[PDB]
Design an enzyme around this catalytic site. Structure first.
Site, PDB file in Angstrom:
ATOM      1  CE1 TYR A 101      17.691 -18.987  40.867  1.00 49.10           C
ATOM      2  CE2 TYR A 101      18.867 -18.242  38.918  1.00 49.10           C
ATOM      3  CZ  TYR A 101      18.234 -19.245  39.624  1.00 49.10           C
ATOM      4  OH  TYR A 101      18.146 -20.508  39.084  1.00 49.10           O
ATOM      5  CG  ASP A 111       8.944 -13.822  34.602  1.00 48.64           C
ATOM      6  OD1 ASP A 111       8.462 -12.707  34.300  1.00 48.64           O
ATOM      7  OD2 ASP A 111       9.885 -13.959  35.412  1.00 48.64           O
TER       8      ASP A 111
HETATM    9  N1  LIG Z   1      24.672 -17.924  29.133  1.00 48.93           N
HETATM   10  C1  LIG Z   1      24.406 -17.064  30.138  1.00 48.93           C
HETATM   11  N2  LIG Z   1      23.315 -17.216  30.919  1.00 48.93           N
HETATM   12  C2  LIG Z   1      23.032 -16.367  31.925  1.00 48.93           C
HETATM   13  N3  LIG Z   1      23.812 -15.308  32.226  1.00 48.93           N
HETATM   14  C3  LIG Z   1      24.941 -15.033  31.523  1.00 48.93           C
HETATM   15  C4  LIG Z   1      25.306 -15.924  30.411  1.00 48.93           C
HETATM   16  N4  LIG Z   1      26.444 -15.447  29.882  1.00 48.93           N
HETATM   17  C5  LIG Z   1      26.791 -14.341  30.591  1.00 48.93           C
HETATM   18  N5  LIG Z   1      25.891 -14.088  31.564  1.00 48.93           N
HETATM   19  C6  LIG Z   1      25.976 -12.959  32.530  1.00 48.93           C
HETATM   20  O1  LIG Z   1      25.136 -13.210  33.672  1.00 48.93           O
HETATM   21  C7  LIG Z   1      24.535 -12.007  34.187  1.00 48.93           C
HETATM   22  C8  LIG Z   1      23.074 -12.252  34.570  1.00 48.93           C
HETATM   23  O2  LIG Z   1      22.995 -13.416  35.409  1.00 48.93           O
HETATM   24  P1  LIG Z   1      21.588 -14.008  35.943  1.00 48.93           P
HETATM   25  O3  LIG Z   1      21.883 -15.251  36.746  1.00 48.93           O
HETATM   26  O4  LIG Z   1      20.574 -14.108  34.830  1.00 48.93           O
HETATM   27  O5  LIG Z   1      21.166 -12.849  36.985  1.00 48.93           O
HETATM   28  P2  LIG Z   1      20.067 -11.722  36.640  1.00 48.93           P
HETATM   29  O6  LIG Z   1      18.816 -12.420  36.155  1.00 48.93           O
HETATM   30  O7  LIG Z   1      20.703 -10.638  35.806  1.00 48.93           O
HETATM   31  O8  LIG Z   1      19.770 -11.160  38.119  1.00 48.93           O
HETATM   32  P3  LIG Z   1      18.291 -11.010  38.733  1.00 48.93           P
HETATM   33  O9  LIG Z   1      18.158 -12.202  39.805  1.00 48.93           O
HETATM   34  O10 LIG Z   1      17.264 -11.172  37.681  1.00 48.93           O
HETATM   35  S1  LIG Z   1      18.052  -9.167  39.665  1.00 48.93           S
HETATM   36  C9  LIG Z   1      24.829 -10.932  33.128  1.00 48.93           C
HETATM   37  O11 LIG Z   1      25.714  -9.977  33.711  1.00 48.93           O
HETATM   38  C10 LIG Z   1      25.527 -11.620  31.952  1.00 48.93           C
HETATM   39  O12 LIG Z   1      26.664 -10.877  31.527  1.00 48.93           O
END
Ligand SMILES: Nc1ncnc2c1ncn2[C@@H]1O[C@H](COP(=O)(O)OP(=O)(O)OP(O)(O)=S)[C@@H](O)[C@H]1O
Ligand SMILES: [Cl-]
Ligand SMILES: [Mg+2]
Lengths: 312, 322, 66
Positions: B26, B143
């Site tokens: 994403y 969600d």
């Molecule tokens: N404040 C924060 N908000 C979101 N993600 C963070 C933050 N700080 C660190 N991260 C890192 O961001 C990653 C997750 O990013 P996201 O954009 O939420 O992607 P995700 O949701 O893991 O992927 P999908 O799309 O759900 S398969 C993790 O590896 C965390 O270590």
């Protein structure tokens, strides 16, 4: 010091798209001046053309807002979506100049992004079909651009539901008659569907204030009764009444009947067409074509200096 | 040369980008820090275009951009610090820095992470306050799950993924029945309900609650029919008696086996008694088949469990990942 | 304080039981709305809040004072 007033002042609408008339006028004038200066600097790179006046920009913005509303009515879209699209249009063309991006396209762009902003994510192809647009990309090319123009504020507050809530609050009074209330609600809702969207109502007044103004236009007695009930149970009352009256006048200057004024062929040929010709001769040469702007920005993002199609 | 473009660049210069913390389908997340205060850390989520979507900006992007701004200001909702467009015509969200991961990785790390009743109480308090703030502003999350509950440096939990949120629909305005991960979807959504309310979120909260107690998904069905069968098995078979009109939902389905009576509070005590009777009561009130009898977020925050000993753990003392 | 000091309590209005609108009657008896868990109380509260939210917010004066 009311809690609802604070929670409204915390909204993006208030902090980003709520100003005084003088601030809004100065912003529009400075945007027009910056557009003129940029286009003049670019052109010399020599008889310059006649650039649009801020008044002409505002007139075209109002005309294309009315046309956007007519289009939304043609697409059987919800009132909230039409209002959001019109608000996105007005905000984009308060932060951007009419001489920079074509309003004929940004109208559809704003309708599409308003659909998205109100929870409706249709297929771009179906959208272009319903609006007889052959190339759907012509719309997408503006989407992100519009997003930048409105400064990423997607939560827009409208006074329709506020109108229904005020009518419910009035329904509890035993002296008021149901038929009068029904007529007042119908007229106030018809007003909210046009007057606050074609004027600068959203920029200087609160959804509650605009709703109370529309009601006062429909039946001043009921609106004054509601305000009197709320404040009976000071200076704040007088200030609220004054703001409501100012909003009422700003709305009365463009009542729903004026729809026929903004769709009139004679008014178009007399007041609109000259402005469009002046714009067609003074428009920005590089930024007008949204599809080409998007293409060149993609190629700049991907291809840094490895070009093989540039001939000089 | 556009004024809005240079304003966006001025906003982008306010934060210095650093290490790349994550690579997601994403968006891509980078560490960053304020230019005026390098001690003030921040997460820069650059939303990458999804080639699979041909209808312009993705719905999750728009939904976050709208609702994260609408809800900002509460301690239990991830803070949208800023928004700006990058030079490559992409979207960037400057958000709170939450380095302690999420609640799913705490729950799953059963070998090394130890937490008790007071910790579950504190976490559930955070989640319930976040959902209450959501509904107070007329927003459905749709969600809610463990991996969408991020943990800040001090231990405060923040509800994060808003890609499926939606404003409260007006009467007669139909909503999608395809929201909330299967394991956490309420029965009315499985039945295709198009006019629902905040209860849909409460159910997910309950399913989070349960998952915190047993440290494993409560109803992990692989198909919608499996989810319905599991809800009938472990919660109760919906019928016209306990849920008037359920058989008329757009996609109502029943496995056509002997109906299971709805389990009472006591029936849960055997499996979830880790949270104590009062606690289990709350659980039960969040897992009502009829959403009309499902507890609301305000009612939830007023439940007797929160004031019942032992008191919830102070956020500074909550378990951290190893 | 169970709401963490964030509890919203309206100042100029109150949501009472007698509030209703005839247009809601046709939905309140709709099978899908009742059996699906649609909250008319939430809609009434939202309508009232939007009708009174920012009633004393004077945009011109407050913005020129900043
Ligand atoms: N404040 C924060 N908000 C979101 N993600 C963070 C933050 N700080 C660190 N991260 C890192 O961001 C990653 C997750 O990013 P996201 O954009 O939420 O992607 P995700 O949701 O893991 O992927 P999908 O799309 O759900 S398969 C993790 O590896 C965390 O270590
Ligand atoms: Cl444990
Ligand atoms: Mg996620």
């Amino acid at each position: 010091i009311a809690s609802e007033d604070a929670r409204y002042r915390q909204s993006s609408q208030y902090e980003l798209w709520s100003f005084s008339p003088s601030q809004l006028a100065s912003m529009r004038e400075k945007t027009n001046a910056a557009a003129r200066a940029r286009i003049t600097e670019r052109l010399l790179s020599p008889t310059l053309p006649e650039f649009l006046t801020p008044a002409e920009e505002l007139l075209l913005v109002t005309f294309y807002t009315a046309e956007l509303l007519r289009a939304g009515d043609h697409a059987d879209m919800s009132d909230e979506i039409k209002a959001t699209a019109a608000t996105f249009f007005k905000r984009f063309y308060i932060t951007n100049s009419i001489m920079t991006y074509p309003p004929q396209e940004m109208l559809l762009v704003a309708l599409f992004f308003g659909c998205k902003a109100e929870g409706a994510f249709p297929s771009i192809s179906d959208f272009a079909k319903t609006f007889g647009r052959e190339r759907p990309e012509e719309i997408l090319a503006g989407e992100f651009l519009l997003c930048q123009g409105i400064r990423f504020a997607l939560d827009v507050k409208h006074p329709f539901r506020a109108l229904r809530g005020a009518i419910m609050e009035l329904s509890t009074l035993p002296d008021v008659e149901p038929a009068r209330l029904v007529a007042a609600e119908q007229r106030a809702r018809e007003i909210l569907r046009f007057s606050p969207l074609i004027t600068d109502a959203y920029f200087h007044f609160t959804p509650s204030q605009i709703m109370l103004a529309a009601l006062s236009l429909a039946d001043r007695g009921l609106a004054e009764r509601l305000i009197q009930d709320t404040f009976h149970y000071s200076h704040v009352r007088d200030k609220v009444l004054g703001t409501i009256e100012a909003c009422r006048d700003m709305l009365s200057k463009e009542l729903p009947e004026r729809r026929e004024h903004w769709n009139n062929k004679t008014v178009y040929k007399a007041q609109i067409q000259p402005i469009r010709k002046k714009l067609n001769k003074c428009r920005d040469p590089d930024r007008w074509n949204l599809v080409e702007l998007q293409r060149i920005r993609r190629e700049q993002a991907s291809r840094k200096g490895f070009d093989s199609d540039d001939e000089g | 040369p556009d004024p809005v473009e240079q304003m966006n660049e001025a906003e982008k210069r306010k934060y210095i980008k650093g290490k790349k913390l994550g690579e997601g389908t994403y968006a891509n997340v980078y560490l960053g820090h304020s230019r005026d205060d390098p001690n003030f850390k921040v997460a820069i989520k650059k939303i990458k275009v999804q080639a699979q979507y041909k209808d312009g900006m993705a719905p999750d992007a728009v939904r976050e951009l709208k609702y994260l701004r609408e809800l900002r200001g509460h301690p239990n909702i991830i803070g949208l610090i800023s928004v700006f467009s990058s030079k490559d015509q992409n979207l960037n969200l400057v958000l709170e820095y939450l380095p302690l991961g999420d609640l799913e990785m705490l729950i799953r790390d059963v070998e090394r992470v130890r937490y008790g009743a007071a910790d579950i109480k504190a976490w559930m308090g955070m989640l319930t306050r976040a959902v209450w703030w959501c509904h107070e502003n007329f927003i459905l999350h749709r969600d809610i799950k463990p991996n969408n509950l991020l943990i800040a440096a001090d231990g405060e939990v923040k509800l994060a993924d808003f890609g499926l949120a939606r404003s409260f629909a007006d009467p007669g305005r139909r909503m999608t029945a395809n929201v909330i991960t299967r394991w956490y979807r309420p029965p009315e959504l499985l039945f295709g309900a198009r006019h629902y309310g905040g209860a849909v979120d409460i159910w997910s909260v309950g399913m989070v609650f349960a998952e915190l107690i047993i440290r494993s998904p409560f109803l992990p069905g692989n198909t919608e029919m499996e989810q319905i069968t599991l809800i009938c098995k472990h919660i109760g078979t919906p019928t016209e008696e306990n849920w008037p009109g359920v058989s008329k939902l757009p996609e109502w389905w029943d496995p056509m086996e002997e109906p299971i009576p709805v389990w009472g509070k006591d029936a849960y005590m055997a499996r979830f008694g880790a949270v104590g009777s009062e606690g289990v009561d709350l659980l039960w009130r969040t897992l009502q088949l009829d959403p009309k009898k499902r507890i609301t977020a305000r009612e939830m925050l007023e439940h007797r469990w929160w004031r019942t000993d032992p008191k919830p753990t102070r956020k500074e003392d909550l378990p951290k990942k190893s | 304080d169970p709401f963490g000091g964030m509890e919203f309590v309206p100042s100029r209005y109150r949501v009472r039981e007698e509030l209703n609108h005839p247009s809601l009657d046709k939905y309140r008896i709709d099978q899908q709305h009742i059996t699906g868990g649609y909250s008319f109380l939430d809609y009434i509260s939202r309508a009232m809040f939007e009708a009174f939210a920012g009633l004393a917010v004077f945009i011109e004066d407050e913005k020129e004072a900043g």
